Amino acid sequence: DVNTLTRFVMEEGRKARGTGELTQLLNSLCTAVKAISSAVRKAGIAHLYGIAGSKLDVLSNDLVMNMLKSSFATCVLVSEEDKHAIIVEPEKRGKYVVCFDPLDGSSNIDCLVSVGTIFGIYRKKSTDEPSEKDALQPGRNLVAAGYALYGSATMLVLAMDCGVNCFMLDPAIGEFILVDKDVKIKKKGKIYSLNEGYAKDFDPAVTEYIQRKKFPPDNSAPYGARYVGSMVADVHRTLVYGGIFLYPANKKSPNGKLRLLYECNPMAYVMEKAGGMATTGKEAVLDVIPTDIHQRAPVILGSPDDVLEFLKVYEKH
Amino acid sequence: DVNTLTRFVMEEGRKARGTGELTQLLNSLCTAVKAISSAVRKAGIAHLYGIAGSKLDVLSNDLVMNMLKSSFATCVLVSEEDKHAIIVEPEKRGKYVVCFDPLDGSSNIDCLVSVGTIFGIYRKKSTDEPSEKDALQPGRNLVAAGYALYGSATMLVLAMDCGVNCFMLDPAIGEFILVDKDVKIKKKGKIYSLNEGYAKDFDPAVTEYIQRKKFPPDNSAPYGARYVGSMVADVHRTLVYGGIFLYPANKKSPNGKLRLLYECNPMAYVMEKAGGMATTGKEAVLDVIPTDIHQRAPVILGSPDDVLEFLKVYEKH
Amino acid sequence: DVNTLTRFVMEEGRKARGTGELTQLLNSLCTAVKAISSAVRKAGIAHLYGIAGSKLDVLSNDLVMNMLKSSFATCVLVSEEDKHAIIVEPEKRGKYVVCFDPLDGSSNIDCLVSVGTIFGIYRKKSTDEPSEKDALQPGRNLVAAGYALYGSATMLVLAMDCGVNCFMLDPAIGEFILVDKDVKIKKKGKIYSLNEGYAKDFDPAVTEYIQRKKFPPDNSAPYGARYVGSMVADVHRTLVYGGIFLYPANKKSPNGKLRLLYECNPMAYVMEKAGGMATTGKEAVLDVIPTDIHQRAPVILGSPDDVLEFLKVYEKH
Amino acid sequence: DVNTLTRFVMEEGRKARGTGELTQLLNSLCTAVKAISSAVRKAGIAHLYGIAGSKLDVLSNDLVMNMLKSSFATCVLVSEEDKHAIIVEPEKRGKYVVCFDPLDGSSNIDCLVSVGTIFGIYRKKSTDEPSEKDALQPGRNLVAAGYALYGSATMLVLAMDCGVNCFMLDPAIGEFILVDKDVKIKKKGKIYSLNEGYAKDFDPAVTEYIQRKKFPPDNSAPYGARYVGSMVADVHRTLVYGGIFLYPANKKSPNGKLRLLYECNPMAYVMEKAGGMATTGKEAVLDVIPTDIHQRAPVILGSPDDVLEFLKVYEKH
Ligand SMILES: O=S(=O)(Nc1nc2cc(Cl)ccc2o1)c1cc(Cl)ccc1Cl
Ligand SMILES: O=S(=O)(Nc1nc2cc(Cl)ccc2o1)c1cc(Cl)ccc1Cl
Ligand SMILES: O=S(=O)(Nc1nc2cc(Cl)ccc2o1)c1cc(Cl)ccc1Cl
Ligand SMILES: O=S(=O)(Nc1nc2cc(Cl)ccc2o1)c1cc(Cl)ccc1Cl
């Protein structure tokens, strides 16, 4: 029997006999996504080209930014687009701290590559004045996380303590329909995703692992390669078809390139909630403890076996 | 000053003081794409999930199939989805033969990866009865070709003798707006796209080439890796950012995996019209001569220098 | 600062520290409206006309019907489209009884005239088994009522104890935006709306009133005539521009033609909540007490002064 | 077998082995309508209400204005929104003169009443320099005329020498689908449409006619009254259900209130092409000869019998 992101969220909140604050927060994020999805698909692009006569990275941030301040459920907001955390006005304060990537893979949107919105929701901890500090919780403290993928179609994957659920956006009625209830990732996959152009800077562990995929030692079948470049898209494929996604440290930043707060953590959390794993090589991504908000991190995630089979090789070095 | 795919096509046809048959054909293809784009984005998916109470590969084929027969400009139609060429009914016959892939990368649409529609338009040659034979012309005989990419947004790239033009689909008014006039590809790019999982079966030439990209000999900067798996998406990125896309022969079919008639040829033609190259390793893709309609072919295409730099290595072996 | 029907409803519910049952109910009705609005505008009509190869009164009923049973907030449902009240399955029962007109003015939808959805929500009273009886409450017992107008644009007018609010449907992002907060109707208007073809059967009171509008006795300016035929549209214009709408008893049914439960009551309630009036000639519409569910009623509603100025004449006879 | 406004227009043009200038003109008008329809339904209204942070009469005019100049098929353009005719730039000149009402019933768009776009297309006559004079042709000189109705759904009625055809706008794929081929109006209808608030100023003929409808002399059934106020909507209902629409001269302008060039003429032409009639009381609307471009005219149109039955009474006075 049919269900929607809204109906579904207020049923969970109303069942956990909660406040409703998280629900308001999520609903507001949902509206923002729909507005972003509309912009990403080139809503009224004909007008920009003078159909009547006479920056997407920004609009997205504003949508999420504005929609979240407006929910009265947020107090501190961190965004890949803002150098500093944003402190919600006093009258608009809520108990939640949100970290998000308004639009990811944006730079590559000229070639219409799948882009997406990532987000993480923590409950404010210290009773001090809400500040950037409140955002430095480890992914292990997430209350809910997820992302919206603007691909061939627009889907929103939401992971909460109760598991991971996928909602398809029906553009004809502007509603998110639940199409994959309590999702779980394959134990082992047949695909490895990473940028092999930096093959030159791969630390030994990584180079050895990739080698075992192209040329399986047990003379089995090789894995298939796939890398869209837009994380949301890659991680999502990893979640659907199973496999492993990698964006390790190298010659550049030995802490990876991806941002921990609003890129690695939400995805790790989703993965782990779906039965997968997310390690930085040394430790679990959700355990890492934030120092800076734009702090980076190495990430290897996906199907258990694959991530484990990685760590296996990681120790060997 | 604003222009659309329709306004633009009937201005070319009306300027070449032509019949208008090609125009009707293109317009019909345009409608089909809009209908496919709507389906790909999950138009009324809420209804499938019982919002009121109680296969995309197919729908696409039917849209294109029906829309083209209905144009009265086609006589013989070849589609990746039909084992045999389709012979248009006598009353609905036109002078054009069309080859198309209704939906490409379809199998990977579960993970919402960019998919697309590819197409090639030839003028019927022999005055015999229209038959599958009429479809066996070499890509060099194309009258027009192109593809529709259903990615973050829906774009339609159209290449004709007059060059290559890109139109963005404004979903708000269902019109294709011309946003990139007479496109031309970069001489050299900084990205190589291919499935490195079949690294095990790469003939020497390919392995050596990829090696020169990961580890540039002139100790320059390496290329970046990118492979979406969905041709339309990859080829399009190659056209926008420049670079090289490869899907060579191996242990499997030594004639590649891609279909020549409705995948390689249209793309080669677009590439060549934009100033790029499309070789099968031995010869230019547009020169190859069709034997079977579902005949396969190896493809290496993109920026000139890159394709040439490839062939350089190809001869070496 | 921006607000939506959802954000707005769950803020009222969450502020009245309520259950959330009413909220789920309203949200479900909201989804149904968006689905209906999509169908009314001819969503995928191209498919019905064989774009790929090979009743609205009903679809609307099913949407509302299904969406409401699915909310778990309804127990007894009455609809202009169902001869008998519908008793929600035990597992899906809620404390609310809903009366609605899935689509009004439907018969006149061939000429694309504004149509709309009307609805009334009562709280079940007797602790007996939910039955048709539970639906026989007087409009005075309404918990919330309203209607959705599918005109030049789709708007949803919601009236609750806290007043009447209007939400515009942004089709680009499928969200209902609050554009007219706590609405109130003009004291006196300059427009009278009714079907003057039945001038032959007007009881004296009505004929005299209309006369005083066409030929104002105080030799002032006449009122303007307007009658769309589709109630939702007429009543809405009455609410926006002010004035009076009439659909009195005559030679036919001396109880009017409009249905009391799901047409007159919701509108009366909205009117009265916006500062207007709704009388049957003898008494207030919200006071009338239901005998049959499809029971009819005479209605005169709109701006106070105008309705009063009517009753003035009504007594005179 | 499926057909669209575009496919249909370029089949007529291509069949009449014409230039294609009229086709380009119509196509451009079609794009403008789709853009207007999108705006009328409140496309991105959420943005106006600060969803991200921080006049329709005009936008419509600009759309049509710009889209027509851009077609290279117009030379002189008259619009209800421009005090003077507009002379297309030399490089953009075409052989056609167009008269249009970008948006009609606009003032009443606050109550979401059906609005519409009306248009008339004449072929420039004098070989002088294109000037306002070229627009003063009688409706009898029309090459094509029609209107777009933005009601419960968006339809475009197109009347040319070959008859009248109706196209429904499928918003899901932004295409106009032909749903009523070569339309013809009922000989006699059962509905009269006019503003009876001006009952006080009706010349005798009109008052007597209306009387014969409310109280049929042959003691038959009365006609039903209907008046939306927005011409496009009323005239369209008249065309679909049959009947008569009236907007006669009175105490105010004895030449009516409707504009002759871009309101009366297009509708008269459509009516007459559908088998109806359009008189000003004294003569046929299409015969009247323009003096001023914003010149007004009395109009009575619709089913033959009804219009005739009117004129019958008209002579009697
Ligand atoms: O803190 S909540 O927002 N509590 C809550 N949401 C409600 C929605 C309705 Cl309609 C009624 C009552 C609610 O309480 C919440 C939200 C979710 Cl996703 C899951 C658990 C909880 Cl605890
Ligand atoms: O064979 S055509 O279709 N000739 C043609 N198209 C017309 C469109 C109009 Cl509106 C009027 C006259 C036309 O002639 C054609 C179409 C294109 Cl894309 C480019 C060159 C030609 Cl040759
Ligand atoms: O009975 S309710 O549905 N109570 C309620 N709705 C909630 C929504 C959230 Cl997100 C959280 C708590 C809620 O409690 C309700 C709904 C409305 Cl329109 C107005 C007053 C009330 Cl009383
Ligand atoms: O003057 S036209 O525009 N001639 C014309 N239109 C064409 C479209 C195509 Cl695709 C090809 C040739 C054409 O010639 C024209 C347009 C219509 Cl609605 C009806 C008759 C005519 Cl005469």
Ligand SMILES: [Mg+2]
């Ligand atoms: Mg990012």
Ligand SMILES: [Mg+2]
């Ligand atoms: Mg394919």
Ligand SMILES: [Mg+2]
């Ligand atoms: Mg009704």
Ligand SMILES: [Mg+2]
């Ligand atoms: Mg007007």
